[PDB]
Design a protein around this nucleic acid. Structure first.
Ligand SMILES: [Mg+2]
Ligand SMILES: [Mg+2]
Ligand SMILES: [Mg+2]
Ligand SMILES: [Mg+2]
Ligand SMILES: [Mg+2]
Ligand SMILES: [Mg+2]
Ligand SMILES: [Zn+2]
Lengths: 237, 27, 149, 100, 49, 82, 129
RNA sequence: AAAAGCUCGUAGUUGGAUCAUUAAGAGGGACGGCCGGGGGCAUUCGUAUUGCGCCGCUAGAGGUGAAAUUCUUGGACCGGCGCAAGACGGACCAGAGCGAAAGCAUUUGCCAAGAAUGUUUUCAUUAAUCAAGAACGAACCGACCGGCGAUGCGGCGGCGUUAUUCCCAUGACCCGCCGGGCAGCUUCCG
């Protein structure tokens, strides 16, 4: 990334010195923004370029120089884990990532001591370096936190696994007990209803002045009188 | 450009908008 | 302040302070009127008639040259539209959406857009009834709308 | 299995990785939040003090930049019918009090 | 006071923004195109005489 | 802020503002005289035209409507009016 | 929406005076606003103002002096008799030594002191001090 | 008187200027070129994984802290070729864009819609907020005047570079300016 261009520039003289001991060349291409590693004819160890490829990848992930070149030693390995794809929601991803580092970096440091591996969280990747058994544990726990299982379970699980290791007895026997346990959709919309103002417009009452509606009420009352006259005639009969 | 205008003639030239367009059509 | 859009646009026409016709204008009041009649006989809306005059004949404002608005000139000659232009265009849009919506059952958005267009049609219809442009019995029906336009 | 007991012993084992000297300051910080009195901040020369503030700020935007790349009144108001949005509203029952 | 101090700082940013936009246009545009006026005689619209 | 007199804005200030935000509204469009090649008859064309303009005499395509100002044909000559 | 261009004009003047501006633009104009601004101007509260005549409702540019604290409008617009004028002054304005109440009468739009001279009352328009 | 949501929308409330006129930095409509993971219907490609078929080879393969369930001489696992099925659409991918919200990411074709910008086009108050009602619906504080940088779209103007137009197409970059957006850093007022 662009923010890593500055750091690499001053520490480039040192890494070329480190690679020259094994006769492997490296180039920091500023225009393309790339780091390239390639062997030479003086080199005699085929596997060092695979280790040389890992070194440039860690530096691109903002890993410090002192830890980065440490993997050049055969005893140390490396593993970069991509966790961005785990959660679609960015807000959930930020929250669970913060759970991994824990308060003051305690859970990160506690994992670092138990695993005996150097772990750094940067962006959507977590970089781990150390013994092969250690890197297996880191991938198991770090991926687990993204799966919405709390880190404190696995950290406490690792501690209990550690105490049983010192015990020479029951090594063959299983540790399962000792490990802790937890109206059909119509496309056409309904017709828009009519407000009151609509109805007298349709009836024509809105334009009509207060000179003939009152006459209509009088006629309606007059009709009811005739109906009353009909009823009084019927009962009289 | 002339061809593009000629295709648009159908939309902007109406045949039933005005009152007289209806009455001589009924004849 | 668009009724169905949260954004507030400001793009519109700004008339100049001057109301006098330019000196270069070689057309008279009578000459412009017959151009309006010929364009109307071709079947053009009054909004489109003003555009043609502005673009080619240099008629910035018909009202300033002839002393009358375009629609008032057409009514005097008898070339009066059956339905108001803005109402007619709105009814035309509703039919096209409804026709598409019959062949696409799952188009929820077209269903939602149809409601908004019908809402503007009902509001404008009540206003025109108040101005007595329409008789106080005209109603907008989905089946009738196709025959209306 | 209790988290509260588990969280703390994880926390204690976590801090030991930092170092013995870092242990003292963090454990001091913890008890402060639980209610201890803070030690008095040492009196320093004002000229020395002002330079330290500028350096303390200068680190902050750099940390802010790196994060970006990785991504009391003396007296009440004199003015307080009811007045709202430039309009004075007068209740009729209060208006009779105004008249009387 | 803070009331006077804030106004002075605000007006300084305004004048620097104009000058940068001024040098951008004059560096590109042709010398004859852009007239040059002295800051003294910038504020005189005309003299009736 | 810089002091501006609302009563007497400078000519470069009022030319820069939006046409609706000036003291008095004034459009930025205008009318022009165009002389097409092929025949030298003069035609008046609106700057922000929305329809293709054809010469009365020779029926040549003069301008093409665009988003803003209409684009003229090559070889034409135009004069701002007024 | 807006009906009381008098209220909006007074609101914009009141807000700017708090902000320490020197000139304000108020729109739209109205003859009611002009008569109101004349009354406040006669007592030295605003100063000279211009009426810009565009062909749509006009605009007014008002110069400020900084002597005005609070100006507002009165919504009920009751009819007030001359004998009841004194009660209306005290219950609205803070004191009796400064500030005026603007009224609209048959004789015109005039403040409370002048209405005493002409022996007339009317409908209450607004106030300023 | 002691200290869930979101939009439409009925009633109600509420709504420019002028002495019929104007054509609101009120609103509606048309027109112009663009723009977008917006929606619907078809269409298509890409690895990975899983299963099946055949060829080569021969005792194991898998899993763990250590094991144990399982699969294997009728060939498991591994290496190669091809076929079928279900999901998914990385890297490019940004605090960018779009939609009333919930939400939206391979390619191509089709249908309808929309924001903003441009407008010396048209109508002329047609408006705002809203209980009722209707559509849709995952699984410190306050409209508090402003400023500075970037950023996305539209438009205007320009010294220069860079390509070039049978069709298709008229751009890429730099500078100034105008609007409406997504957001920052700051101030001013109640
Ligand atoms: Mg528009
Ligand atoms: Mg308008
Ligand atoms: Mg359009
Ligand atoms: Mg498109
Ligand atoms: Mg699209
Ligand atoms: Mg641009
Ligand atoms: Zn010609």
């Amino acid at each position: 990334p662009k923010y890593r261009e500055a750091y690499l520039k001053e520490c480039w003289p040192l890494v070329q010195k480190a690679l020259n001991e094994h006769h492997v060349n490296a180039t920091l291409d500023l225009i393309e923004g790339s780091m390239t590693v390639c062997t030479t004819k003086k080199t005699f160890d085929p596997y060092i370029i695979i280790r040389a490829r890992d070194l440039i990848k860690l530096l691109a992930r903002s890993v410090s120089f002192e830890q980065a070149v440490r993997i050049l030693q055969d005893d140390v390995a490396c593993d970069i884990i991509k966790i961005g794809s785990l959660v679609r929601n960015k807000e959930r991803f930020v929250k669970r990532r913060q759970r991994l580092i824990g308060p003051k970096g305690s859970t990160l440091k506690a994992l670092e001591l138990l695993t005996n591996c150097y772990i750094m969280v940067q962006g959507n990747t977590v970089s781990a370096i150390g013994p092969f058994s250690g890197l297996k544990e880191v991938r198991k726990v770090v991926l687990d936190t993204m799966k919405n299982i709390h880190p404190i379970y696995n950290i406490k699980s690792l501690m209990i696994k550690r105490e049983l290791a010192k015990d020479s007895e029951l090594r063959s026997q299983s540790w399962e007990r000792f490990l802790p346990q937890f109206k059909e959709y119509t496309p056409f919309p309904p017709p828009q209803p009519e407000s009151q103002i609509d109805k007298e417009l349709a009836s024509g009452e809105y334009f009509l002045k207060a000179n003939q509606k009152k006459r209509q009420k009088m006629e309606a009352i007059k009709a009811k009188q005739a109906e009353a006259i009909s009823k009084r005639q019927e009962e009289r009969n | 450009v002339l061809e593009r205008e000629r295709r648009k003639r159908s939309r902007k030239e109406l045949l039933n908008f005005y009152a007289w367009q209806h009455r001589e059509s009924k004849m | 302040g668009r009724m169905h859009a949260p954004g507030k646009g400001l793009s519109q026409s700004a008339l100049p302070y001057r109301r006098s016709v330019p000196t270069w204008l070689k057309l008279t009041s009578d000459d412009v009127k017959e151009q309006i009649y010929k364009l109307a006989k071709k079947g053009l809306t009054p909004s489109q008639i003003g555009v043609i005059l502005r673009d080619s004949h240099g008629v910035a404002q018909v009202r300033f040259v002839t002393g009358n608005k375009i629609l008032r000139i057409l009514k005097s000659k008898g070339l009066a539209p059956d339905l108001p232009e803005d109402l007619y265009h709105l009814i035309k849009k509703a039919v096209a959406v409804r026709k598409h919506l019959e062949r696409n059952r799952k188009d929820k958005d077209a269903k939602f857009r149809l409601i908004l267009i019908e809402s503007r049609i009902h509001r404008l219809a009540r206003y025109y009834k108040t101005k007595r442009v329409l008789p106080p019995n005209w109603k907008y029906e989905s089946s009738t709308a196709s025959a209306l336009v | 299995f209790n988290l509260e007991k588990a969280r703390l012993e994880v926390h204690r084992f976590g801090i030991t990785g930092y170092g013995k000297g870092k242990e003292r300051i963090l454990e001091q910080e913890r008890a402060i939040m639980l209610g201890a009195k803070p030690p008095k901040k040492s009196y320093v020369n004002y000229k020395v003090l002002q330079e330290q503030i500028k350096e303390k700020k200068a680190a902050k935007e750099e940390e802010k930049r790196l994060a970006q790349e990785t991504d009391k009144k003396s007296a009440p108001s004199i003015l307080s019918g009811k007045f709202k949005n430039g309009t004075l509203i007068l209740s009729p029952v209060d208006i009779k009090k105004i008249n009387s | 006071p803070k009331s006077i101090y804030s106004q002075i700082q605000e007006q300084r940013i305004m004048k620097e923004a104009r000058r940068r936009k001024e040098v951008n246009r004059i560096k590109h545009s042709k010398p004859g195109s852009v007239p040059l006026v002295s800051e003294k005689k910038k504020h005189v619209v005309a003299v009736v005489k | 802020p810089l002091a501006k007199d609302l009563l007497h804005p400078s000519p470069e200030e009022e030319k820069r503002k939006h046409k609706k935000k000036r003291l008095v509204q004034s459009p930025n469009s205008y009318f022009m005289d165009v002389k097409c090649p092929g025949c030298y008859k003069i035609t008046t064309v609106f700057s922000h035209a929305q329809t293709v303009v054809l010469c009365v005499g020779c029926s040549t395509v003069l301008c093409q409507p665009t988003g803003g100002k209409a684009r003229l044909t090559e070889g034409c000559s135009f004069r701002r009016k007024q | 929406v807006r009906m009381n261009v008098l209220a909006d004009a007074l609101k914009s003047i009141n807000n700017a005076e708090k902000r320490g501006k020197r000139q304000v633009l108020i729109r739209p104009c109205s003859k009611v606003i002009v008569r109101f601004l004349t009354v406040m101007m006669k007592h030295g509260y605003i100063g000279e103002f211009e009426i810009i005549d565009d062909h749509r409702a006009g605009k007014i540019v008002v110069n400020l002096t900084g002597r005005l604290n609070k100006c507002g409008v009165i919504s009920p617009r009751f009819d007030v008799q001359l004998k009841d004028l004194e009660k209306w002054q005290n219950n609205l304005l803070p004191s009796r030594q400064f500030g005026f109440i603007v009224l609209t009468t048959s004789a015109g739009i005039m403040d409370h002191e002048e209405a005493r001279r002409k022996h007339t009352g009317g409908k209450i328009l607004g106030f300023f001090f």
